[PDB]
Amino acid sequence: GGGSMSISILKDKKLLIGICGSISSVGISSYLLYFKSFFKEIRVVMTKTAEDLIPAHTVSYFCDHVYSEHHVEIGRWADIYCIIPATANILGQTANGVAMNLVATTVLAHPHNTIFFPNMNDLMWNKTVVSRNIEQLRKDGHIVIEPVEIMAFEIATGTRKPNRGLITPDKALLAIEQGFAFYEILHLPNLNEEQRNAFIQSLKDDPSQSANLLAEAKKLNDAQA
Amino acid sequence: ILKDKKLLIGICGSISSVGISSYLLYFKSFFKEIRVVMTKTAEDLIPAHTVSYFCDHVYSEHEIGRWADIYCIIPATANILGQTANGVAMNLVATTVLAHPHNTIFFPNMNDLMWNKTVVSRNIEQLRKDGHIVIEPVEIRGLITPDKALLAIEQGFAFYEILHLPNLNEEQRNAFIQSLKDDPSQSANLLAEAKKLNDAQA
Amino acid sequence: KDKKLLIGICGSISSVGISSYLLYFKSFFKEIRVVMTKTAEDLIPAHTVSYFCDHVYSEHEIGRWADIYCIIPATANILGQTANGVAMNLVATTVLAHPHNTIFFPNMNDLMWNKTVVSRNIEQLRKDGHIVIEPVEIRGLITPDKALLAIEQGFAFYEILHLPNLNEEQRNAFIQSLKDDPSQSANLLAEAKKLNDAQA
Amino acid sequence: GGGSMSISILKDKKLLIGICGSISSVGISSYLLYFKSFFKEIRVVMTKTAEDLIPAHTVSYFCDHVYSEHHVEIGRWADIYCIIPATANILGQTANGVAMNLVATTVLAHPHNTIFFPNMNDLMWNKTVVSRNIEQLRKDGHIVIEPVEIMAFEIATGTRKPNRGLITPDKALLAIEQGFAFYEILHLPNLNEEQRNAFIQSLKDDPSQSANLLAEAKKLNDAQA
Numbered sequence A, D: 001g002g003g004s005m006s007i008s009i010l011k012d013k014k015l016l017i018g019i020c021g022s023i024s025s026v027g028i029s030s031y032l033l034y035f036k037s038f039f040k041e042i043r044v045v046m047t048k049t050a051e052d053l054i055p056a057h058t059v060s061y062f063c064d065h066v067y068s069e070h071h072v073e074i075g076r077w078a079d080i081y082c083i084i085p086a087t088a089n090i091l092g093q094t095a096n097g098v099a100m101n102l103v104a105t106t107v108l109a110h111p112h113n114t115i116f117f118p119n120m121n122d123l124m125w126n127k128t129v130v131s132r133n134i135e136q137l138r139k140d141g142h143i144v145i146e147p148v149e150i151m152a153f154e155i156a157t158g159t160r161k162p163n164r165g166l167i168t169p170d171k172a173l174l175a176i177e178q179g180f181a182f183y184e185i186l187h188l189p190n191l192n193e194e195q196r197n198a199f200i201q202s203l204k205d206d207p208s209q210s211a212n213l214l215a216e217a218k219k220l221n222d223a224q225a
Numbered sequence B: 001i002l003k004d005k006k007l008l009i010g011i012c013g014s015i016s017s018v019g020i021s022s023y024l025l026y027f028k029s030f031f032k033e034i035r036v037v038m039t040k041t042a043e044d045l046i047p048a049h050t051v052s053y054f055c056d057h058v059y060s061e062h063e064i065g066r067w068a069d070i071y072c073i074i075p076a077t078a079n080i081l082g083q084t085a086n087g088v089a090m091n092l093v094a095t096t097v098l099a100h101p102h103n104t105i106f107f108p109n110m111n112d113l114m115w116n117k118t119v120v121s122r123n124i125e126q127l128r129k130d131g132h133i134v135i136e137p138v139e140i141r142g143l144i145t146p147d148k149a150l151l152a153i154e155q156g157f158a159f160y161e162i163l164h165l166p167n168l169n170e171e172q173r174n175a176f177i178q179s180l181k182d183d184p185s186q187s188a189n190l191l192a193e194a195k196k197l198n199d200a201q202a
Numbered sequence C: 001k002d003k004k005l006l007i008g009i010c011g012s013i014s015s016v017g018i019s020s021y022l023l024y025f026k027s028f029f030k031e032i033r034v035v036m037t038k039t040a041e042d043l044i045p046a047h048t049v050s051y052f053c054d055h056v057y058s059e060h061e062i063g064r065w066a067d068i069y070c071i072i073p074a075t076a077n078i079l080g081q082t083a084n085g086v087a088m089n090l091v092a093t094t095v096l097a098h099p100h101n102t103i104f105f106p107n108m109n110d111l112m113w114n115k116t117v118v119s120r121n122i123e124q125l126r127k128d129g130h131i132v133i134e135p136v137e138i139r140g141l142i143t144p145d146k147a148l149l150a151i152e153q154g155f156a157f158y159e160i161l162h163l164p165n166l167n168e169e170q171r172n173a174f175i176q177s178l179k180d181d182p183s184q185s186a187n188l189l190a191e192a193k194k195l196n197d198a199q200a
């Protein structure tokens, strides 16, 4: 199924997007504008390197507000906290509980969990620490959306090298929907392990079903209070 | 037939400048060398250091007309059209139009409202009467895609080159032009045939 | 006629008194915003002008926000820019970004006013659909009340001239009554719209 | 054997040296100048604290170029990336995949592995986290050259306390040669565990043999393709 199918569950949600210092951040509007018609309100928090690549005044044209590091309530303001693109550095900080910029701090100050969208060249992606930190973030309850292997321009080399890049805005929207349904189903009180793994396994096989799955998981929740 | 030429791209203060990389990278495999000159508003939207990752050099408002073999302004604002159409040159982008030998290819980009303003159409027609080329935008009204932009650049180069062949006559001149306005992907084959009829009639 | 009015201030000494106009316009329009050039800000700070209107746009959207865009006072430079399609400051740009036409209130000394290029730019602006209110010989601005009457008259001019499914008869009938009583603009235009939809 | 014996393998190599905020950085010229006659080209990337101790304009007198934090291609530019002197902080960042300055980022963006030269007083060296991070860097494939116990001036105390200091420029040059031969031999395709451990064990017993060892390990590589 498609991406614009579980729109229901994002209709009233506040989305906070953290932008890190990756060259793909220059194109973040393609994500922002696409998300704009699905959430109640979208705000952005940026690192300094992201601001050096693309100014906060530019990003503000594509969302409701931009938080710059020159704001500790934004983690509670957001219903969904998504970091895209996420650098190896933000993964290292968040996986190790270090919070030196507002994006990494928002991970700790945000109530539930964070959805990361890593983006780096294949060289950095194959470093041991990066994989270790990804797996630590996953074990701590955060969600790390896998990038796709493509041949993109390498800023460093001026030629096309192998790069681990972002999924399209619709596949990202599906990833956010799926992840939200993941956390909500995982933390429903009046359910047992078999029904919970039943709802989770069908989310990993068809994420466009998130709306229908979550909607049914809530009604089996109250029926079993 | 552009692998020999130096391409200079001037960026003006439009939000579409944030996507200029999509053009720069695409052009990179067709021209000998691509450099960029920016306005201050364009730099405020997207820094010159960011653009530099996608080209050979970026000239900021902090010679280049003669360096370029082809000068393309993309995106072009209404203001840059008003300046160039009236011979006013207050930033480096407009000045390069005056300092560049031959003609300039403009890629205007504006909302549908500004495009229908009388002064804007007047300035477009003035630029066209002065020998410059103004590429029409499409409805998606935005800029054409990088592949169509490349075809338009090629077509414009072939236009100016055929129009300024010395020992050729009006009928064959419009003959080479009319087949370019009907098939721009033939620019390589037509221009190559126009030069060999040139020396054959010396 | 509770439309939104945007006023552009150019670098003229008369800008120091722009409040006398703003306040007067404020007593007719419910919402008034101002956009300034840098020179106008050097003469009178934007924070000072902000005491007399709802918001001041500085050089440190608004064309579509405004229903009526009026440049007062307008310098020779702003006339040269707007007449030639050149937009180098926010005031001149708003002329291009505004959906309809602009009302200019030129203010300059008689020397600059009698220069050929200035008259040429005025006539070019008029030929392009913009309205240029004539100054008085003192060459200064008309009083605020007459300025408000001129703004109403100009707005109704453009609105009546562009009625789609209405004919030259009723259109010239609504126009001739505007040149004789501009304070009737609100009553005239309101009657022109209802004859509009009645003749769809 | 001596240090100027395996010069062959550095003749065509580009060396990037990262300087961290240690007082020994004030004397880095003794290393730079000594290395200058052995590599094709030597560039430097500095942290802010290193720049506070010794200005980048001063270091530029002793190498080909100085990268200051006020440059993501330098990791691919370098053939060999060496961090000297390395602070406890740079070890903490690199061991945990955190990249907040250009030196630590270059570790991730550099294609192979990094050779660290730690330098700190004996007090910091005996902290548990420092040893843990050293061992983590070693387990992740990086090389950490051991400092030597001496009695040096303590900036903090104005008297001589025990300090863990750098090896001489020639022993460092040997360490770089040895480490380069280590990685190259470790990643030769057409070799088996017994021949590889044979080449490695003789590198740990005589590093001045690196040139002869690597040269032979390549010719047994192609002979076994």
Ligand SMILES: Cc1cc2nc3c(=O)[nH]c(=O)nc-3n(C[C@H](O)[C@H](O)[C@H](O)COP(=O)(O)OP(=O)(O)OC[C@H]3O[C@@H](n4cnc5c(N)ncnc54)[C@H](O)[C@@H]3O)c2cc1C
Pocket: A019, A020, A021, A022, A023, A024, A047, A048, A049, A050, A053, A086, A087, A088, A089, A090, A100, A101, A119, A120, A121, A124, A155, D071, D072, D099, D100, D101, D102, D105
């Ligand atoms: C053009 C370019 C593209 C890049 N693309 C990628 C990529 O796709 N993937 C990838 O993994 N890496 C990439 N990097 C490297 C990455 O930017 C560095 O690792 C950087 O240090 C991490 O940036 P960040 O936005 O995650 O955090 P940053 O906020 O950038 O943290 C480091 C930077 O922030 C500033 N800073 C100062 N104090 C602090 C503080 N207390 N907390 C936080 N920041 C501080 C510093 O000036 C420093 O440059 C790129 C670098 C460049 C120059």
Ligand SMILES: Cc1cc2nc3c(=O)[nH]c(=O)nc-3n(C[C@H](O)[C@H](O)[C@H](O)COP(=O)(O)OP(=O)(O)OC[C@H]3O[C@@H](n4cnc5c(N)ncnc54)[C@H](O)[C@@H]3O)c2cc1C
Pocket: B011, B012, B013, B014, B015, B016, B039, B040, B041, B042, B076, B077, B078, B079, B080, B091, B109, B110, B111, B114, C087, C088, C089, C090, C093
């Ligand atoms: C987000 C945004 C998007 C826009 N998109 C479009 C569009 O698609 N189409 C369109 O026609 N118009 C657009 N405009 C309006 C356009 O930017 C203005 O008309 C502007 O004056 C055009 O500038 P330019 O890039 O043509 O040349 P510029 O060189 O930008 O023209 C002069 C401008 O540059 C700055 N500048 C020049 N020299 C200096 C200096 N020495 N110091 C400081 N500042 C200096 C000034 O602030 C001035 O506004 C847009 C404006 C904005 C804010």
Ligand SMILES: Cc1cc2nc3c(=O)[nH]c(=O)nc-3n(C[C@H](O)[C@H](O)[C@H](O)COP(=O)(O)OP(=O)(O)OC[C@H]3O[C@@H](n4cnc5c(N)ncnc54)[C@H](O)[C@@H]3O)c2cc1C
Pocket: B090, B091, C010, C011, C012, C013, C037, C038, C039, C040, C074, C075, C076, C077, C078, C088, C089, C107, C108, C109, C112
């Ligand atoms: C005391 C005083 C009295 C005046 N009286 C009159 C009058 O009676 N009538 C009249 O018509 N005018 C008057 N002017 C304005 C003056 O005559 C000029 O015409 C002035 O440049 C008008 O500009 P502006 O008001 O439109 O402001 P703006 O359009 O903002 O003027 C442009 C300003 O930006 C700066 N600038 C320079 N280069 C650039 C660039 N490339 N891009 C952007 N900005 C640039 C300049 O310093 C200049 O002041 C007066 C000015 C002063 C100081």
Ligand SMILES: Cc1cc2nc3c(=O)[nH]c(=O)nc-3n(C[C@H](O)[C@H](O)[C@H](O)COP(=O)(O)OP(=O)(O)OC[C@H]3O[C@@H](n4cnc5c(N)ncnc54)[C@H](O)[C@@H]3O)c2cc1C
Pocket: D019, D020, D021, D022, D023, D024, D047, D048, D049, D050, D053, D086, D087, D088, D089, D090, D100, D101, D119, D120, D121, D124, D155
């Ligand atoms: C004179 C002196 C000598 C020292 N000698 C030693 C030694 O021999 N061994 C040892 O282990 N420690 C030493 N230290 C302590 C060490 O400098 C600190 O731990 C320091 O924070 C690490 O410096 P660095 O060069 O590794 O990284 P730094 O780049 O120095 O990181 C911290 C410093 O960088 C600046 N900074 C700001 N934002 C960022 C960012 N996003 N990323 C990186 N840096 C940022 C800060 O101003 C801060 O002071 C010494 C300190 C001093 C003052």
